[PDB]
Amino acid sequence: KSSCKRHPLYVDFSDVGWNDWIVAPPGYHAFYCHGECPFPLADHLNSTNHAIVQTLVNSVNSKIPKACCVPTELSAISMLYLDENEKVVLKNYQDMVVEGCGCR
Amino acid sequence: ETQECLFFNANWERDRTNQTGVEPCYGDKDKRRHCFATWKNISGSIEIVKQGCWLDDINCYDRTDCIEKKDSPEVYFCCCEGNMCNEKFSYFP
């Protein structure tokens, strides 16, 4: 209910101004995580004990902020780009795509 | 399906890697696997830059041939699905 979850985000390399730098891909679905971390923190939020305590403290004292909705599982993508010398570099970048969101 | 790709690295001497051969592709969990080719083209003269495996990429889904479809790029690229699919590559702007 406006709770912590994965949201759409397509990263278009033209919109970032990286068209001349990145040969492939043209962009990619990164996603992002957003939403409130309510009490209680449900199983699929994969919370730490600390996020659980902070959530409880926040419900007693609003000055302590709530836990935060962040990626807890991410996957890799391949990229091809041009370096300083105009040479083609291949890289598999880890942790580029949000697969799961949780409260931390 | 994609278990191996043709491999090429023009920078092999600097990188201290291999130059040409076969590359096995490993996936995640139940992520697709792909091959890619990338090359330069000086007035009909094809200079291969890199070939190899490519991670799960929506731009490569269900492409059994490796074709660059962009108009006169400075560095040509294609990716595909299927064993050794980067062995031969084409250009259709």
């Binding site: 209910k1 709770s3 979850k5 994965r6 009490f39 209680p40 923190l41 449900a42 199983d43 699929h44 994969n46 919370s47 730490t48 004990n49 659980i52 305590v53 409880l56 419900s59 007693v60 609003s62 | -």
Partner: protein, 88 residues
């Protein structure tokens, strides 16, 4: 411990089937009163880790709410928690 199945409502993961979720921890039901005095019910799965704290809850929470936990298949359905007395 178990392979535990729970009803979920308001706390469902995006891959829930039949409004159910699976967990190694507990099923819960919660009644809560929002900052406007509207009362709602919600239910779901809680990880075993941190469940001591969540099932206990804080008696000093600013909003009225009661959470109840159980560890039996879909036991969630039989939980009827009641809001605690208004703090005077």
């Amino acid at each position: 411990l178990p392979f535990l199945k729970c009803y979920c409502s308001g706390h469902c993961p995006d891959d829930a089937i039949n409004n159910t979720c699976i967990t190694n921890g507990h099923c819960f039901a919660i009644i809560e009163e929002d900052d406007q005095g509207e009362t709602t019910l919600a239910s779901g799965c809680m990880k075993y880790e941190g469940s001591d704290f969540q099932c206990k809850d804080s008696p000093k929470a600013q909003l009225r709410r009661t959470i109840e936990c159980c560890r039996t298949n879909l036991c969630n359905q039989y939980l009827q928690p009641t809001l605690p007395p208004v703090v005077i």
